[PDB]
Amino acid sequence: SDVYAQEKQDFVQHFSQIVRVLTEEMGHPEIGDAIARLKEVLEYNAIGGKYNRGLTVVVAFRELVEPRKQDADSLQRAWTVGWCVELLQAFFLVADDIMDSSLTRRGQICWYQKPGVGLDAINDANLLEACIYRLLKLYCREQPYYLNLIELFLQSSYQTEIGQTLDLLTAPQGNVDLVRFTEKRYKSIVKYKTAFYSFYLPIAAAMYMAGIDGEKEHANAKKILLEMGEFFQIQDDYLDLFGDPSVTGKIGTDIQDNKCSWLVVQCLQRATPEQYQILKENYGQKEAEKVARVKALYEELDLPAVFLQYEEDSYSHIMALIEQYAAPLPPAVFLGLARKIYK
Amino acid sequence: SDVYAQEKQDFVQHFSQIVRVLTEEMGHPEIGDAIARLKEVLEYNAIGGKYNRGLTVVVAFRELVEPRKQDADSLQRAWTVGWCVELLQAFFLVADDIMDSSLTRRGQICWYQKPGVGLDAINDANLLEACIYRLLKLYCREQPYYLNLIELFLQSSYQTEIGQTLDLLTAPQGNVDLVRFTEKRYKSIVKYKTAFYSFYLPIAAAMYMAGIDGEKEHANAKKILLEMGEFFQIQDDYLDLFGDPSVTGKIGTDIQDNKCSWLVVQCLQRATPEQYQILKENYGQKEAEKVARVKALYEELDLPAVFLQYEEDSYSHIMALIEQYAAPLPPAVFLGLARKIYK
Numbered sequence: 001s002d003v004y005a006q007e008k009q010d011f012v013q014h015f016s017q018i019v020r021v022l023t024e025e026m027g028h029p030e031i032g033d034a035i036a037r038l039k040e041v042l043e044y045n046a047i048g049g050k051y052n053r054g055l056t057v058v059v060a061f062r063e064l065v066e067p068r069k070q071d072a073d074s075l076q077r078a079w080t081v082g083w084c085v086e087l088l089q090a091f092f093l094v095a096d097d098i099m100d101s102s103l104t105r106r107g108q109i110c111w112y113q114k115p116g117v118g119l120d121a122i123n124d125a126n127l128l129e130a131c132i133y134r135l136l137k138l139y140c141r142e143q144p145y146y147l148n149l150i151e152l153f154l155q156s157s158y159q160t161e162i163g164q165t166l167d168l169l170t171a172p173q174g175n176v177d178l179v180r181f182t183e184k185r186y187k188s189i190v191k192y193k194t195a196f197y198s199f200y201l202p203i204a205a206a207m208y209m210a211g212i213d214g215e216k217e218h219a220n221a222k223k224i225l226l227e228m229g230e231f232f233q234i235q236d237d238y239l240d241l242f243g244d245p246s247v248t249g250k251i252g253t254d255i256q257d258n259k260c261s262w263l264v265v266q267c268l269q270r271a272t273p274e275q276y277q278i279l280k281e282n283y284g285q286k287e288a289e290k291v292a293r294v295k296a297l298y299e300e301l302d303l304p305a306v307f308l309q310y311e312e313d314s315y316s317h318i319m320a321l322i323e324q325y326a327a328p329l330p331p332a333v334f335l336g337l338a339r340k341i342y343k
Numbered sequence: 344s345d346v347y348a349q350e351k352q353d354f355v356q357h358f359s360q361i362v363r364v365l366t367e368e369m370g371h372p373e374i375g376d377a378i379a380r381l382k383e384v385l386e387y388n389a390i391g392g393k394y395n396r397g398l399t400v401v402v403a404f405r406e407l408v409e410p411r412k413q414d415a416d417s418l419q420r421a422w423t424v425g426w427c428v429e430l431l432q433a434f435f436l437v438a439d440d441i442m443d444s445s446l447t448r449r450g451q452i453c454w455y456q457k458p459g460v461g462l463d464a465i466n467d468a469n470l471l472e473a474c475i476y477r478l479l480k481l482y483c484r485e486q487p488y489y490l491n492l493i494e495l496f497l498q499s500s501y502q503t504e505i506g507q508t509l510d511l512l513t514a515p516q517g518n519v520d521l522v523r524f525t526e527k528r529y530k531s532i533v534k535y536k537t538a539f540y541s542f543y544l545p546i547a548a549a550m551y552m553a554g555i556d557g558e559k560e561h562a563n564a565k566k567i568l569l570e571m572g573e574f575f576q577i578q579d580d581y582l583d584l585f586g587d588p589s590v591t592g593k594i595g596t597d598i599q600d601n602k603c604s605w606l607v608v609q610c611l612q613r614a615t616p617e618q619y620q621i622l623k624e625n626y627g628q629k630e631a632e633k634v635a636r637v638k639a640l641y642e643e644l645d646l647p648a649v650f651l652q653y654e655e656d657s658y659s660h661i662m663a664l665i666e667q668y669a670a671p672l673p674p675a676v677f678l679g680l681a682r683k684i685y686k
């Protein structure tokens with residue numbers, strides 16, 4: 001019994017309540033059609049993932065709040081904030097999929113590729129962001145942690161946008177970018193692109209909902225959860241190329257799109273001058289033959305083997321960090337995450 | 344002496360302070376390059392308009408706050424919130440210009456058309472939105488009206504996104520859309536697309552900064568300022584086609600892009616069955632010959648003459664509304680706006 005698997009059904013049943021509430025703007029019929037589009041956008045975009053971000057809010061809330069203080073209303077609010085993290089994710093996916101020229105995401109066609117959508121998806125993305133603060137207001141405005149949450153969601157959006165900015169600056173389309181594919185850069189991107197919103201946001205949200213706002217207590221959780229995010233994104237980079245797309249649900253574009261991948265960084269640290277030139281001639285181009293040559297060089301440098309060795313050392317390191325920095329929180333908050341992202 | 348013309352210089356000099364403060368993330372050098380991109384985005388996007396939104400915050404603040412309560416610090420905060428409205432505008436412009444396939448805006452090439460930008464502009468737009476809440480925090484977090492402002496900016500973003508959603512649903516590319524070009528629809532779009540953020544937001548912001556949070560006092564200002572926004576957008580639609588682009592600064596795309604324009608609505612209300620078919624065969628297509636045929640039909644129905652007659656009746660109506668609903672606020676708050684948007 002994973003604490004996630006158990007709390008999942010109740011979380012998904014709540015979604016209908018989220019949608020019913022964000023569409024009922026019933027005293028405003030003039031915008032009826034727009035609420036219909038909003039409903040379509042949520043059903044397509046916020047559904048069909050494993051929900052691990054939002055569930056993490058709901059799990060962590062159960063582990064942190066004295067069970068006497070778990071009234072039906074307090075639960076609603078945890079389900080909602082969890083959903084708020086999912087909406088945040090759906091905002092970044094919809095928009096990132098346009099920017100990266102993605103085909104597919106979680107097994108179906110990307111929202112912007114659906115006929116009759118295209119660049120209108122920009123506006124659709126923006127609405128998904130809007131919906132967060134509409135829910136925080138409708139469910140948490142009388143709560144003492146309300147402002148803390150609003151500030152947490154916006155700070156998380158700013159840091160992800162900063163991370164996306166680095167990702168894009170490091171990966172100019174059409175140009176040879178290998179010079180700027182460094183470890184220092186790589187760590188910076190993933191810290192800001194992924195780690196803050198995927199790991200810190202959901203735990204931090206639950207922490208606040210439990211009246212734990214201590215600056216040192218948020219610093220210490222952050223110190224664990226950012227390293228968890230670093231490993232997670234390194235695995236996302238690994239699976240972008242070597243994953244099984246009946247599992248990953250998406251096609252890898254990192255080579256064609258010219259991304260500062262963990263893989264390309266590792267490959268640069270190991271290449272002969274000769275191998276550098278294979279990579280230089282083949283990386284960052286839409287041609288299937290050139291993406292194949294890169295995968296072949298990665299496999300010749302046994303990077304999948306280097307990834308397996310990093311997944312080992314990372315697990316040990318992360319565990320040593322939960323020793324150092326979990327207290328006073330139940331270690332189970334952290335361990336439940338580690339269980340979910342190391343197979 | 345327009346109260347706007349006078350307060351302008353001081354407002355623009357402040358911009359350098361906005362940029363210095365949002366880039367000084369000086370204890371975070373790893374994201375240096377991203378702050379550089381942020382700086383470029385602000386200089387290109389938030390500069391070269393007439394600033395009327397943001398100035399309206401600063402004017403209204405002077406008219407509403409007892410001059411004893413106008414300390415140097417209280418001014419900084421008014422300049423900042425004003426700038427916050429400008430950043431909001433710059434967010435919607437950058438993104439709307441991608442969606443509408445705009446060439447130019449305020450006399451220069453659209454940000455997304457600049458070589459090496461393209462769809463990365465989506466992320467750039469998102470950062471401009473982020474910057475608002477970064478400034479509200481840095482300048483207003485200790486103020487009693489802080490939450491009121493955060494809620495005001497987000498509500499304004501949601502209503503604009505709803506309005507954009509209606510605009511897009513009413514204007515499907517490739518299809519004949521004349522059926523859905525009604526007055527009821529037209530008014531709904533502009534209320535939500537333009538009026539809330541262009542008129543209500545800046546006055547409402549100043550009102551809050553002056554401790555005026557009364558529900559009836561915000562209802563009454565809103566009642567005036569939304570009708571001002573309706574007229575403003577009807578004039579924006581008129582100038583989209585009949586404007587002087589050394590004045591308007593932008594090329595009109597409303598015909599090619601298939602927009603529920605005031606012009607197309609008025610034209611539909613007046614056409615012979617025959618003229619309907621000219622419009623039906625020529626509206627919503629990229630071909631210069633078909634956009635020319637539409638302008639010719641508009642000119643044959645003396646719509647520019649109908650626009651002049653509406654600009655008359657609107658001015659009278661708006662003035663009768665400031666009679667009814669300005670109190671207890673100085674009428675000058677409202678009149679200063681009317682002066683700025685009727686020539």
Ligand SMILES: Cc1ccc(-c2cc3c(N[C@@H](Cc4ccccc4)P(=O)(O)O)ncnc3s2)cc1Cl
Nearest residue numbers: 304305306307308309310311312313315316342343
């Ligand atoms: C979460 C997690 C998931 C998978 C692993 C794996 C480790 C490993 C392995 N490790 C050897 C070392 C190794 C061998 C080949 C390639 C990389 C490392 P060992 O340390 O001698 O057991 N050899 C073959 N397959 C595997 S899978 C470790 C962890 Cl901590």
Ligand SMILES: Cc1ccc(-c2cc3c(N[C@@H](Cc4ccccc4)P(=O)(O)O)ncnc3s2)cc1Cl
Nearest residue numbers: 050052053056198199235336337339340341342343
């Ligand atoms: C904060 C957070 C963010 C994302 C996740 C995800 C985990 C996961 C997954 N994990 C599987 C395990 C796993 C499979 C392959 C590689 C790594 C872990 P599970 O054990 O079925 O949950 N399999 C597919 N997609 C995802 S997304 C988990 C968390 Cl706690």
Ligand SMILES: Cc1ccc(-c2cc3c(N[C@@H](Cc4ccccc4)P(=O)(O)O)ncnc3s2)cc1Cl
Nearest residue numbers: 647648649650651652653654655656658659685686
């Ligand atoms: C803010 C503002 C800006 C311009 C106008 C104009 C009105 C008008 C006009 N009005 C005539 C009526 C009219 C004539 C032709 C076309 C439309 C209306 P009138 O009422 O007899 O003076 N005839 C020619 N030119 C103009 S410009 C009115 C307003 Cl209150």
Ligand SMILES: Cc1ccc(-c2cc3c(N[C@@H](Cc4ccccc4)P(=O)(O)O)ncnc3s2)cc1Cl
Nearest residue numbers: 393395396399541542578679680682683684685686
């Ligand atoms: C809330 C708000 C939003 C936008 C505006 C704008 C006004 C304006 C303008 N007005 C000129 C007058 C004018 C010119 C043509 C048509 C209408 C008014 P001005 O008198 O020089 O300020 N000329 C070009 N662009 C703009 S944008 C003003 C406000 Cl008080």
